[PDB]
Amino acid sequence: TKDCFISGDINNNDLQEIRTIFDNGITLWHTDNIGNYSVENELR
Amino acid sequence: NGYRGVYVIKKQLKAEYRRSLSSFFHKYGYKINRVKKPNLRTRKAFNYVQTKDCFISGDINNNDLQEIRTIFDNGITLWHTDNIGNYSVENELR
Amino acid sequence: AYVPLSGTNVRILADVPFSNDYKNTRWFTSSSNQYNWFNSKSRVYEMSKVTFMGFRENKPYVSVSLPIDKLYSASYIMFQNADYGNKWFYAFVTELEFKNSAVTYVHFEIDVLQTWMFDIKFQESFIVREHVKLWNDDGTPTINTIDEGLS
Amino acid sequence: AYVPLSGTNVRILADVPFSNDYKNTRWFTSSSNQYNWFNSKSRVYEMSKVTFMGFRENKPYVSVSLPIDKLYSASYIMFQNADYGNKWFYAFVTELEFKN
């Protein structure tokens, strides 16, 4: 993202860190073989 | 269809851009690119001044003199009226 | 002009949804409307009087006579001052610090937007972006053509 | 909203494959699914109660009554807190330090 908006009942320091994470780019893994890019990764 | 002789067609920028540019010049004057003494007090309400590598002397300690030169190299508005910040005025030539 | 070193009618609030990155804030039409909004927030704690600590090393905090676990939901502080009359000062809670079992240091940072909201005067400024009128009364689009540089 | 300074049901885990550079993480559909995933990790150590140190200088750490060699595989910590009810808190292990 860029300049993402994220809210929640969370101390503002951590909330700011979470926004930085997504503004920097992150891969969210839904499987346990994290890092294995050989999979098809089709739509869910 | 009535076309003979020569025609004079006068053209000007649209109102949107006239507003944009006029408001900008009002506040910040024009690009000058001249080596000269600065216009400090030539308008009625305020003068914007921005230099590069300006020369300023005086019977002044050199630390403060260096600070003053930095101020003008960074740009400053000199207000000649007590209504500081009010850009609504015409600010005509003095 | 300067933020006081002591407060009265102090309230620590929960659930104030903006932060000291100042990318968002709740804007108000009056100081009374502002007060009413903050007054509607749950109060984690109140004190009639307190003296602030840490202003010099610019990390202000207040001593709160509560165990730290009673303050886990603290997010904001508001206070008045004997010498500022009716004026409310507003601040983010930024940190909780254990001093002992019954005492907690609550660190805060003055919210300069909320605190000075009705004291500032904008003069003519170079506007990069803003929200403008979209339609004329006859339903035609207003003319806005400045090159956005977007595909 | 704030992370507590003490923990209960503390577990130090081995083999958690993401880091504090936050370029990758395992995403979950529920807090229960999340808990189950972490609970299935091998435990290097457990404690029913602990008080955290260093929250002050933002260098948090916990005192662990184990020889350092039993902790060489430590990678992650999870803990609950008396005042947060059922909530689990999660943390990267970033360093081991000899005390005695």
UniProtKB/Swiss-Prot annotation, chain B:
Subcellular location(s) per record: Virion
Subunit relationships: Homohexamer; forms a hexameric tube structure with six flexible hydrophobic loops.
Protein's name according to its UniProt entry: Tail knob protein gp9
Protein task: Distal (knob) tail protein that plugs the end of the tube before DNA ejection and forms a channel perforating the host membrane during ejection.
Organism taxonomic ancestry: Viruses, Duplodnaviria, Heunggongvirae, Uroviricota, Caudoviricetes
Curated annotation (Swiss-Prot), chain D:
Localization in the cell: Virion
Superkingdom, natural source: Viruses
Free-text function comment from the UniProt entry: Distal (knob) tail protein that plugs the end of the tube before DNA ejection and forms a channel perforating the host membrane during ejection.
Subunit structure: Homohexamer; forms a hexameric tube structure with six flexible hydrophobic loops.
Protein name listed in UniProt: Tail knob protein gp9
Organism: Bacillus phage phi29
Span within the parent record: 2 to 101 of 599
